[PDB]
Amino acid sequence: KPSIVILGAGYGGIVAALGLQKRLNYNEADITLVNKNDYHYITTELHQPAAGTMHHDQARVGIKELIDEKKIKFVKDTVVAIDREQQKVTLQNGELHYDYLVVGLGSEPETFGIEGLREHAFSINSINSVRIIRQHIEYQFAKFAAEPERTDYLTIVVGGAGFTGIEFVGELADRMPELCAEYDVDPKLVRIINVEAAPTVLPGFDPALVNYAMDVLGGKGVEFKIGTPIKRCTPEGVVIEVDGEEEEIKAATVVWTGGVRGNSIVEKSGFETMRGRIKVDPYLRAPGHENIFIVGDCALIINEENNRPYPPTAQIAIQHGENVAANLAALIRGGSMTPFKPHIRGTVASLGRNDAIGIVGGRKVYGHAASWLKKLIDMRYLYLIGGLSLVLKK
Amino acid sequence: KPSIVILGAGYGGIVAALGLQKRLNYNEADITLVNKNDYHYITTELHQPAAGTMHHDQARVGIKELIDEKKIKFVKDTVVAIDREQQKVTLQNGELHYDYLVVGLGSEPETFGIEGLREHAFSINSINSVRIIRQHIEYQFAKFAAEPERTDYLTIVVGGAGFTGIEFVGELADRMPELCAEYDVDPKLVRIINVEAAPTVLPGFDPALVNYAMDVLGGKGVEFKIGTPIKRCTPEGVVIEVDGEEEEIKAATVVWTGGVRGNSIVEKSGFETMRGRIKVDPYLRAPGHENIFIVGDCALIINEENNRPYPPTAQIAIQHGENVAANLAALIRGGSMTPFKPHIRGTVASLGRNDAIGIVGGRKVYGHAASWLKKLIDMRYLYLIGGLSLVLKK
Ligand SMILES: Cc1cc2nc3c(=O)[nH]c(=O)nc-3n(C[C@H](O)[C@H](O)[C@H](O)COP(=O)(O)OP(=O)(O)OC[C@H]3O[C@@H](n4cnc5c(N)ncnc54)[C@H](O)[C@@H]3O)c2cc1C
Ligand SMILES: Cc1cc2nc3c(=O)[nH]c(=O)nc-3n(C[C@H](O)[C@H](O)[C@H](O)COP(=O)(O)OP(=O)(O)OC[C@H]3O[C@@H](n4cnc5c(N)ncnc54)[C@H](O)[C@@H]3O)c2cc1C
Ligand SMILES: CCCCCCCc1cc(O)c2ccccc2[n+]1[O-]
């Protein structure tokens, strides 16, 4: 029996694994699924627990529940490095050998070398991280009543006005009334600030959607600072550049949604990478490796029409997983692989609990409709991996 | 018309104000009630929100609701000093003059000059403080999952094994299962440590009850270090003395229940004070001042039978308030005052939500019975100050 090793149980990894379990018969191969946690989390909704609008347990599921213990062997450990020559994967507590390898370790934050951003700012990339963000903000609001001169406790700075940042500041904006009521806080004193180095909010997106989103968020008191880069980050706050002059923002909380890169383990293992990402062949394999597959945020796909990269998304990650599952099955049985072509359908960005903006099939959508559509998509992924029972569980 | 000014709306202050409300007519005197908050909190239960076993709103009530808008004028401000000579009380937002003064500003923490104890340890003395404590602890538990090597996050040091410390560690012990469930924490790694400089817990209490309480709490994994004083306190933890040799405990959370003193305002105003408290005459007046009354934790009472001091408690504070109300009513109307005689009917100490120990009148009580007893006492105070409606609201 040949050995298939999947690193990371994210969208790409979980979809690849479930695909392989569905397609292959017993002892056709030995499949090992590796994750640093015994759970798989819904990354696309991680902004809600970070704000506290949703419990974090509703954003994750047990891996053992989803998979087949007979077909797939699950290992809970942390990947340290990959040795291409030895075809071996190093772990915190052991080592593994692969005939075939699928890499889906997802993304890690890119702080661009900005000072203090790594040490003193938070990221929305895991259950742990969002629990920390939530509890941090609650702690600051708790501290304010005893020390009312410190309005920096009530100031939250979100760096980067991208997809994630917009969704997050929307959730925070919705969370603020209950949060203020809980800690005897004057709602007027609260400051939610979204800071973008780029000249436009949601750069590379349709201006109508951007302006609508900006109007809605601004109505709920969210402030936007545009064309404003962050020079440095401290525990007290951030230093930004306005009109070519340094300016200071005092904030107990700084959340970084500025940029992401592929996992550093991949680059550190000797792969040639752009932004930590691998520009894979039409079969989603690593260039030079017939037995190594890259999925999700780790893989880089270029759009032949405009020669610009596809953004790192869960939507395309799932498709990577399905394609890799099929190609692995074919490779295992002697067959020919099918080239991967991405089909990018609608996309929705939430703006609080009851509002959203997005493009589906060329058709722009707003409000309650778009909100329900996004909820629908989430339910679709839940169904796809867990069935009706998983959707019922939440 | 004479002017009576009441400083602090605690047990003594609130009871005094309500008593004056019942006894006097609409123009017999001018009564001013001063508080730094617009609410009165149930100090005797503040340990529950501190652990997170109860919502903080269940520990407080609005002052304007309880009193009579016609009879008593309520001022929300923070007392700064009292000028005995001018008979004036200075405030953050104004000043007042008194013909008669009632001082019931309660207690402040006493750290005895132990290093770093004031700066880096928490106290259970207000709604704000317990919200800060609970959110702090939750924050540490939130941080643990990302850094499992930092077990100091799961270590809580409670200094002083008095009434408050014992009740608090009991509440923490009950709180730990849900807390651990919330943040993916192994309960075995959690350490709750109660540190006492004295060789025995709860001096002046029945040793059977004490040993029983320690047995019960010890069953819940609570650690006791007795005869161990705290040499100093740091953000990392505390430094204690064992066998005349220094030892270190690494703890993210340190809560001080070691000692209390009378409000520092009293001492700073030129009054003669012992432990920040005033040894009052049989009429609860300040020695040398016929128009100044001291109540609650600010007042020091000695038992004439055995010459030992009465501990600063809510029960005796309430009794102080009623006595001062009666005596002031007599003084304004030309009558004879009655000396204060304290009647201590016993007190019960909780050991988590479902356990307690206590002596009532003469009968020793354990378990669910004692727990229900404590709840009943709470109901008694609630009825006494707010009527049936106050009890009904909770
Ligand atoms: C708030 C937020 C909102 C988003 N909304 C959308 C949306 O609406 N639509 C959309 O298309 N995309 C959205 N995305 C992007 C989407 O979530 C990611 O593109 C998706 O996670 C793809 O990443 P992945 O499949 O490669 O794996 P990931 O989701 O990144 O998961 C990687 C897995 O591997 C584990 N892991 C990582 N390193 C190791 C290691 N050394 N050892 C062991 N295990 C490891 C991790 O614990 C994790 O389980 C959003 C992202 C965020 C943060
Ligand atoms: C966990 C805990 C459990 C306890 N259990 C019991 C028990 O079971 N039985 C018992 O008899 N006793 C118990 N006690 C003790 C009791 O709570 C206090 O002794 C009680 O509060 C009496 O103090 P006080 O009424 O004088 O003032 P406090 O109740 O302490 O407060 C005085 C009021 O004045 C306000 N104030 C303070 N300073 C200022 C200022 N400068 N300006 C304006 N306002 C101010 C405060 O906000 C407060 O509202 C317990 C105490 C604690 C912490
Ligand atoms: C149900 C009809 C709408 C179809 C659009 C789906 C495209 C789409 C868009 C997303 O933003 C996704 C985010 C996470 C997972 C899947 C996603 N999908 O599948």
Q: Tell me, letter by letter, the H, E, C secondary structure of chain B.
A: CCEEEEECCCHHHHHHHHHHHHHCCCCCCEEEEEECCCEEECHHHCHHHHHCCCCHHHHEEEHHHHCCCCCEEEEECCEEEEECCCCEEEECCEEEECCEEEECCCEEECCCCCECHHHHCECCCCHHHHHHHHHHHHHHHHHHCCCCCCHHHHEEEEECCCHHHHHHHHHHHHHHHHHHHHCCCCHHHCEEEEEECCCCCCCCCCHHHHHHHHHHHHHCCEEEEECCCEEEECCCEEEEEECCEEEEEECCEEEECCCEEECHHHHHCCCCCECCEEECCCCCECCCCCCEEECHHHEECEECCCCEECCCCHHHHHHHHHHHHHHHHHHHCCCCCCCCCCCCCCCEEECCCCCEEEEECCEEEEHHHHHHHHHHHHHHHHHHHHCHHHHHCC
- Tell me if A190 sits within 8 A of A221, measured CB to CB: yes
Burial of A390 (0-12, 13-18, 19+ CB in 10 A): middle
Q: Is ligand 2 within 6 A of the CB of residue B269?
A: no
Residue among A363, A366, A360, A323 at smallest CA distance from A345: A360
Beta-bridged to residue B247, according to DSSP, are B240
Q: Which residues contact A52 (CB under 8 A, 6 or more apart)?
A: A134, A137, A138, A175, A179
Task: Report the separation in Å between the CA atom of B391 and the middle of ligand 2, taken as the mean of its atom positions.
Answer: 20
Q: Which residues contact A94 (CB under 8 A, 6 or more apart)?
A: A77
Query: Helix axis angle, A127-144 relative to B127-144, nearest 10°?
Result: 160
- How far is B129 from B123, CA to CA, in rounded Å? 7
Q: The tokens of B85 are what?
A: 């000579």
Q: Which residues contact B385 (CB under 8 A, 6 or more apart)?
A: B14, B15, B18, B40, B66
- Taking the alpha carbons of A178, A180, A186, A188 in that order, is the dihedral positive or negative? negative
Nearest chain B residue to A56 by CA: give it: B182
Burial of B207 (0-12, 13-18, 19+ CB in 10 A): exposed
List the strands of the sheet with A72-76, edge to edge.
A72-76, A30-35, A3-7, A100-103, A292-294
The helix or strand, by DSSP H or E, that contains position A360, with its residue range, turns out to be strand A356-360
Q: Which residues contact B277 (CB under 8 A, 6 or more apart)?
A: B261, B262, B266, B297, B298, B299, B300, B312
B314 appears as a binding residue in the annotation: yes
- Tell me if A5 sits within 8 A of A34, measured CB to CB: yes
Q: Is ligand 2 within 6 A of the CB of residue B285?
A: no
Q: The tokens of B18 are what?
A: 């309500």
* DSSP class of A115: B
Q: What's the CA angle centered on B116, arms B111 and B121, to 5 degrees?
A: 70
Q: The tokens of B354 are what?
A: 């479902």
Catalytic residue at B167? Answer: yes
- How far is B312 from A167, CA to CA, in rounded Å? 52
Residue among A7, A44, A23, A2 at smallest CA distance from A379: A44
Q: Which residues contact A46 (CB under 8 A, 6 or more apart)?
A: A59, A124, A125, A126, A127, A129, A130
Q: The tokens of B139 are what?
A: 């924050």
Nearest chain A residue to B135 by CA: give it: A139
- How far is A146 from A25, CA to CA, in rounded Å? 64
Between A and B, how many CB-CB pairs are < 8 A?
A: 47
Q: Which residues contact A228 (CB under 8 A, 6 or more apart)?
A: A195, A196, A197, A240, A241, A242
* Closest ligand (CA of A108): 1
Give the nearest partner residue to B143 out of A132, A142, A183, using CB atoms. A132
Look up tokens 């229900």; give the residue. B372
Q: The tokens of A393 are what?
A: 């569980």
Residue among A294, A236, A273, A235 at smallest CA distance from A102: A294
Whether the CB of A60 is below 8 Å from some CB of chain B: the reply is no
- Tell me if B185 sits within 8 A of B145, measured CB to CB: yes
The helix or strand, by DSSP H or E, that contains position A157, with its residue range, turns out to be strand A155-159
Q: What domains can you pick out in chain A, each with its CATH number?
A: 1-394 (3.50.50.100)
Strands A94-97 and A88-91: antiparallel
φ, ψ for residue A347, nearest 5 deg: -145, 130
Q: The tokens of B339 are what?
A: 């000396």
3-state secondary structure of A258: coil
- How far is A172 from A269, CA to CA, in rounded Å? 39
3-state secondary structure of A326: helix
Nearest chain A residue to B184 by CA: give it: A128
* Closest ligand (CA of B59): 2
- Does the distance separating the beta carbons of B135 and A146 come in below 8 Å? no
How many CA within 13 A on the CB side of residue A22? 13
- How far is A360 from A364, CA to CA, in rounded Å? 6
Strands A299-300 and B230-233: unpaired
Whether the CB of A378 is below 8 Å from some CB of chain B: the reply is no
Whether the CB of A354 is below 8 Å from some CB of chain B: the reply is no
- Taking the alpha carbons of B276, B280, B284, B285 in that order, is the dihedral positive or negative? negative
Cα separation values, B90 from A91, A150, B35, B107, B283, Å: 67, 25, 13, 19, 25
Q: Is ligand 2 within 6 A of the CB of residue B320?
A: no
Q: Kindly provide the resolution of this structure in angstroms, with one decimal.
A: 2.8
Q: The tokens of A102 are what?
A: 């699928």
Say which amino acid occupies A20. L
